[PDB]
Amino acid sequence: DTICIGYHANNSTDTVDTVLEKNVTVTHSVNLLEDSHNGKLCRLKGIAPLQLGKCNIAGWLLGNPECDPLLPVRSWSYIVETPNSENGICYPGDFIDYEELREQLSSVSSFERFEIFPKESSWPNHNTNGVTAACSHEGKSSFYRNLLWLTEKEGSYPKLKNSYVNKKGKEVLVLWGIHHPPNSKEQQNLYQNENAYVSVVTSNYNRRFTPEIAERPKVRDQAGRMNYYWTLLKPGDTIIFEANGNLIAPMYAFALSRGFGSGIITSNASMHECNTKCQTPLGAINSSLPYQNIHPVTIGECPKYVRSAKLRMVTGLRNIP
Amino acid sequence: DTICIGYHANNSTDTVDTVLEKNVTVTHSVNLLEDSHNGKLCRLKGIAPLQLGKCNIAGWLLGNPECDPLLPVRSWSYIVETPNSENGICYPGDFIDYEELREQLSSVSSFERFEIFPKESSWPNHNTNGVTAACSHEGKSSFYRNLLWLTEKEGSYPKLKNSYVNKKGKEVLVLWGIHHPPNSKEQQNLYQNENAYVSVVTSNYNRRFTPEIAERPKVRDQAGRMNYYWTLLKPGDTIIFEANGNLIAPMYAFALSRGFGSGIITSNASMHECNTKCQTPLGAINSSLPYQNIHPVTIGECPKYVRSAKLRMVTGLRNIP
Amino acid sequence: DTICIGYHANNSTDTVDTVLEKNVTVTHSVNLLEDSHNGKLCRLKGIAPLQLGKCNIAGWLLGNPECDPLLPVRSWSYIVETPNSENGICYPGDFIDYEELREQLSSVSSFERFEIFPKESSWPNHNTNGVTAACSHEGKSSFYRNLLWLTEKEGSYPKLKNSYVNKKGKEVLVLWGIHHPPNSKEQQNLYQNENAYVSVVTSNYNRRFTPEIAERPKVRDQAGRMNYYWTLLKPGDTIIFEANGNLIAPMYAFALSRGFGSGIITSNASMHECNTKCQTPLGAINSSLPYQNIHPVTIGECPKYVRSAKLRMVTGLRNIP
Amino acid sequence: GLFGAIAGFIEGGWTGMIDGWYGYHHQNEQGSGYAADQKSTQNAINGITNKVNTVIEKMNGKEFNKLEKRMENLNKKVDDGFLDIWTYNAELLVLLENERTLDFHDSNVKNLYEKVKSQLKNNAKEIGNGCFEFYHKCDNECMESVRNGTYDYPKYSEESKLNRE
Amino acid sequence: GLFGAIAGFIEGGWTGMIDGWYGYHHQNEQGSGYAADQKSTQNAINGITNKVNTVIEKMNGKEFNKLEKRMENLNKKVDDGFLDIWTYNAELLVLLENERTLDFHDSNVKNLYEKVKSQLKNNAKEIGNGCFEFYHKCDNECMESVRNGTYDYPKYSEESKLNRE
Amino acid sequence: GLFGAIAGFIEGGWTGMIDGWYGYHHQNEQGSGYAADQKSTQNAINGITNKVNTVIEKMNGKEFNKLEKRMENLNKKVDDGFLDIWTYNAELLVLLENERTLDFHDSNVKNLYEKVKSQLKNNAKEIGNGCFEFYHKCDNECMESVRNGTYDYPKYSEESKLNRE
Amino acid sequence: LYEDPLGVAGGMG
Amino acid sequence: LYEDPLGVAGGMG
Amino acid sequence: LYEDPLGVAGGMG
Ligand SMILES: *[C@@H]1O[C@H](CO)[C@@H](O[C@@H]2O[C@H](CO)[C@@H](O)[C@H](O)[C@H]2NC(C)=O)[C@H](O)[C@H]1NC(C)=O
Ligand SMILES: *[C@@H]1O[C@H](CO)[C@@H](O[C@@H]2O[C@H](CO)[C@@H](O)[C@H](O)[C@H]2NC(C)=O)[C@H](O)[C@H]1NC(C)=O
Ligand SMILES: *[C@@H]1O[C@H](CO)[C@@H](O[C@@H]2O[C@H](CO)[C@@H](O)[C@H](O)[C@H]2NC(C)=O)[C@H](O)[C@H]1NC(C)=O
Ligand SMILES: *[C@@H]1O[C@H](CO)[C@@H](O)[C@H](O)[C@H]1NC(C)=O
Ligand SMILES: *[C@@H]1O[C@H](CO)[C@@H](O)[C@H](O)[C@H]1NC(C)=O
Ligand SMILES: *[C@@H]1O[C@H](CO)[C@@H](O)[C@H](O)[C@H]1NC(C)=O
Ligand SMILES: *[C@@H]1O[C@H](CO)[C@@H](O)[C@H](O)[C@H]1NC(C)=O
Ligand SMILES: *[C@@H]1O[C@H](CO)[C@@H](O)[C@H](O)[C@H]1NC(C)=O
Ligand SMILES: *[C@@H]1O[C@H](CO)[C@@H](O)[C@H](O)[C@H]1NC(C)=O
Ligand SMILES: *[C@@H]1O[C@H](CO)[C@@H](O)[C@H](O)[C@H]1NC(C)=O
Ligand SMILES: *[C@@H]1O[C@H](CO)[C@@H](O)[C@H](O)[C@H]1NC(C)=O
Ligand SMILES: *[C@@H]1O[C@H](CO)[C@@H](O)[C@H](O)[C@H]1NC(C)=O
């Protein structure tokens, strides 16, 4: 007549590492490291992303005509650029403080694209039809959808000065560009005054531009270039443009709303009808476990990224059958 | 006849958390997390702070007359701005590299406010009486206590050029301003030369300013603005000002000393006759325990800030009475 | 007749700290903290460093003649400046974006110093013999080995414009300088046009310089100064210089290769015939243990720097003899 | 393990015991059987659930132009340092927690054995492998009396004394 | 606990023992009494003081304009990451230290019990609850002989043998 | 220690035992001797080698002009914070690992003692200091039978019963 | 039949 | 009466 | 004579 003490054993092959021992077979364990993704771009807390397709941020904002136009009002949970978006700054030049603008839009949840200066009533006695082959659409030479090339009309470039007052209750992002012809002769034939000047003012922004004429190596077969500038007109403030040449006037601007939890990712995954709390450039994640070795770039409530291949916590016993 | 082994128990209700169990009542514990402050602004290692009252850093440095003037020599252990200091830059304009100057003064322990260019002997054949309503004091129009508005006298603005040599054995912080009238007519009536220029030089600083005339939305009912610049003249070096208009000359400058452990805090707590080793915008801390959940902003020898609500280390036993 | 259980003891005086006890003598331990260095500057994965001797980075790049010239092609594993390199910017002025250039060279493993614009064929109808006492070599007045002072010849400074096309398959670092005379009379006697201008262009770089004339406190007995600028011409791109005065033309440029694991250190240790995987400004380290309290500045595969004086892990038993 | 029971003086586990982490095997006249110890198993499940929970809840994109290399490298240093710290912390925590959990199970089963032994006294002999051979007849009621902790020593004291001689 | 004594085979503590963390209760002819074990209590106080000390001593404002958003966000990322790391470290350290300290106390009192038991041998019987009933008369001198670790087994061997029969 | 053996009921170590971490001393007719326990020593060496290994492998210059003070201070804050975290982590890890290792050795030798004791049963008496005095004659073959874990209790049961009376 | 919300013991009573 | 500088044992002898 | 690659036991058999 005997009685015995013992402990549970089963057929589990789960193994966990300890300090003193490595391949320890245990009766039960729980995994803490998520390593699986669905390979899809999915909605985030019920909101679809904003996909730019062939355009990057610069091409979309400036209005590169090669990119399928987006609806006038859009709202997203995160922005997706694709790795090699062919369309961007199509007429050569530098996008001044571009990275800061990317960072700004990293917290934007909304845009309304609205006409700020209509083509036919904002710049009288100037020609609004300038195009170029550097930004071609449908084979023929074109120009940005959100800007307007102001040229001389009938041999004269009168001094223009226009204004906008922000009555949208939100920040309005305004972009424009300044042209730099390669030779003086072009500046003459385009704006008629060699010493032209542009001035853009708000209550907290202030800049004055003067065309810098110099022969430059031709990029997209353009020896002259075109700088692009931007600003955030606060609610109630006024933006003032004054010029006598070289100004690439704004036509469409954006009324922005600010949100939480968004960002910009580069991904060549495709949008599916799905929903997650955690998006990575490779796919969605279940945000249930504390760690993930999928991608350091995450958007949403997401496990902490680590380099480990295995994080497994034993709950059962040492399996000795 | 019996003997027994046992352990201590008492009436303690202290509870601590372990890995396997949460509300464990114990006979004795020590707290590691300080969560109490006195609500007062107190001295730091025996040195009172510098309180700016109605002024922020910019208003104090520029000499906004609405702020109760401070004694000529002052030394502090930390600077306190109050949340909504109404007085600052009173004539509109931008304070160039202002944040860098804040960071500089974050390690300053001393100032001597001294006259660098006396009003009555530094700018002959120019008028030194300019005032404005944007910086009003006692109802009437006034101007910064540390700068001087140089205008035309008897219809002419002769080219001025003055110099200072730093014989204070310390860094001397020098500030000045450049005016930008809204229309050319004002620049004519104020300095008589439309193409005026200012030049400020040291051995390692060099800048040239030219007035940029443009109609701007009127802030504090001023359509023209006034930029403010600063520099740190090293011991032995010379600062040179040369201008023919638009210069807002320096009058008073600051001789700075550098120290350790200081900083700038925003706080609406009041100074009391007290002393601490650790100040937070909410109040003082006993710097005895290693952690504190009071405020991430600390000055002095201070516990590390954490988010936890309870950090308690058991020393006694499990309390089983 | 007895049998006994026991444990090992020896004459070890090794002591380790635990949580409950401090000076615990143990039978065996292993050290984890390396605290010994050889005091020498040694090769890194078989590659000698680049030592600049009396020159800093700026003096070497600009070609200060007081520094023993280096072979035309050099390749290193890390750069060593010595604490007080007397030779650097020898004609006064500011090295624009110098820190960014230091950071660039922090990942450079190679340079070929090559003539980009020969002295005798690149700037006709201009004089290429300008020297100064601020950069003296062998007692007499001299100039940078990599730049060329372009002055007026026979009373006239014709507009020069030259070009280079990068056919080196690598980035080519190009440096130049712009002169700022103290008085207008000097600008007249040196370049004959008071309103001179320089323009330097690539496909992604663009800058226009105009001499700023102002009397400055004489440094190295020079009241005028000389700014220095640089750029990285990508493979295949073209750099264009155009000027009518004030240009300090480039003569020698550098073809750079990029590598991994390098950096810049300040050290007054001397090179020996030796080899390490880990270099510190004090000496070499055996990269076998995980920690080191020698220096926070390391280059190569190196233990993590900590402040601790002792990190020792017990392997044996409590030593009780 | 640290407490000598699991993989120690109790060489292996019991796949026949499907009803608990620790427990008993009996063989008497009326037959044989396994029987989990539900209180110790439930307390261990409580503790380990708490451990898993607190580990689960202790844890709760920029660009740069060509002239901002220093800031790019500082951002990368920050990201890499945080990654290093968190990988280190996760792996360390898991290792130490696994060690402590295995030792927890070892301690629990050794405690079980000692409770039974101090209940039984000299009314049985330790025959190794974590088993006691009774010096008296122990029916299912006596086995449950040992399991529930209510073993009556004087009830069988004299009979076990006799057979122990 | 991990060692089976506290909240284990010694079910509860002694509020009547005000003079130490661990100790003894005796009852003989001359009466009853508590008596702390001062050496074990002092050694435990040493160890725990050291633990508290090393935890206490292991631990020893910018602005940005509108065009410096990237640097503002990097500064905030740095502050938040350090805050995360330090909150995590503090809470983890406290949890593991509390577990180890409770187990330390458990181990100390179990060691006390075992020292007494191996001193007494069969001159007394274990009656549970951490108590021994002597097979002989044990006066205050004998009780202190057990406390100071100087129990004379052959002195009472024969008398305890007789009463144990 | 935590398990009562090292610096406990076995007061000191054996400098005469040069062949292992734990082991035995015997004295019988044929003389005296030390003898390491090679299996327990080798298993402990395995575990401690693994501990050292995982600690060894868990772990695997800018300038600023006068107008970049904020970035200089952020870089210094980053460097200092990482330094703080890593110094803290290294010192903490070493302290806890040393505690666990000393307790590991304590547990190993206590387990050794208990294996011998449960092998011997009443064929010997515990005389303290971790020693058993046999109630029978135990030659070198019997000593190795105890060491290899093959002690034959019924072989000497009756002789030890007689001398134990 | 234990209260095992996380399935720590894999069902098991 | 123990050497208890931090009051770890709350007075207690 | 133990397999002690790191010399954890300082030679010792
Ligand atoms: C992890 O541990 C398991 C448990 O022993 C090992 O699995 C056995 O390995 C041996 C030798 O390689 C084989 O003969 C058995 O068939 C394996 N059993 C099973 C169920 O797979 C395994 O090798 C260990 N892995 C590592 C990397 O150590
Ligand atoms: C913390 O532990 C204590 C100790 O048991 C708990 O206090 C008792 O809780 C019960 C049930 O809520 C009450 O009936 C008792 O009156 C309480 N005793 C005292 C002295 O307060 C307490 O509930 C636990 N708290 C948590 C959050 O678990
Ligand atoms: C570290 O521990 C050792 C071990 O006891 C101490 O060394 C002894 O200290 C006493 C008193 O100072 C001396 O009388 C002995 O001669 C020392 N022995 C040896 C071998 O040196 C030592 O003092 C301890 N150190 C600290 C700082 O606690
Ligand atoms: C393991 O055991 C389970 C029973 O719980 C059974 O369903 C499963 O098929 C078994 N697997 C193997 C590989 O034996
Ligand atoms: C694009 O998707 C393909 C498909 O697997 C993948 O191989 C490639 O790495 C992806 N490119 C990028 C930049 O992610
Ligand atoms: C707890 O006990 C102390 C005696 O040490 C006594 O002073 C105190 O009043 C008691 N408190 C309660 C709530 O019983
Ligand atoms: C100012 O003090 C009041 C008093 O409690 C407080 O409610 C308020 O939050 C404080 N304001 C700031 C900005 O700290
Ligand atoms: C310690 O013992 C070793 C033998 O292993 C011996 O060589 C050494 O000299 C001894 N040192 C001292 C100080 O006793
Ligand atoms: C230069 O070397 C000497 C020699 O010991 C040393 O004292 C000094 O600190 C070193 N200087 C620097 C800047 O490292
Ligand atoms: C055993 O314990 C259970 C529950 O505490 C009780 O109902 C029962 O009467 C006890 N005795 C036996 C013999 O089962
Ligand atoms: C007990 O120990 C104390 C102190 O070591 C000693 O003075 C005393 O003589 C010992 N014996 C008795 C019976 O107290
Ligand atoms: C002891 O164990 C060894 C190895 O397992 C074996 O060879 C030997 O026969 C056993 N018995 C004796 C008496 O040595």
Residue numbers in the entry:
A (entry chain A), B (entry chain A), C (entry chain A): 11 to 54, 54A, 55 to 83, 83A, 84 to 95, 95A, 96 to 125, 125A, ...
D (entry chain B), E (entry chain B), F (entry chain B): 1 to 60, 67 to 171
G (entry chain G), H (entry chain G), I (entry chain G): 1 to 13
Quote the paper:
Here we report a unique, efficient and effective structure-based strategy to design peptidic modalities based on a single domain antibody. This strategy was used to graft the relatively long and flexible CDR3 loop of the single domain antibody sdAb38 onto dipeptide templates to design mimetics that can potently bind and neutralize influenza A viruses. To elucidate the structural basis of binding and neutralization of influenza virus by the PMD-based peptides, crystal structures of the neutralizing (template-based CP1 and CP8) and non-neutralizing (non-template based CP14) peptides in complex with H1/PR8 and H5/Viet HAs were determined at 1.59–2.87 Å resolution, respectively. All peptides recognize the hydrophobic surface and embedded cavities at the interface of HA1-HA2 in the HA stem region. This region is highly conserved in HAs across influenza A groups 1 and 2 and influenza B viruses, and the target of HA stem broadly neutralizing antibodies (bnAbs), including sdAb3854.
Finally, direct head-to-tail cyclization was attempted. All three peptides show similar binding modes, recapitulating the key interactions of sdAb38 with HA. Peptides (CP1, CP8 and CP14) all mimic the binding mode of sdAb38 by occupying the same hydrophobic groove in the HA1/HA2 interface on HA, and bury on average ~148/440 Å2 surface on HA1/HA2 respectively, which is comparable to the surface area buried by sdAb38 (~141/675 Å2).
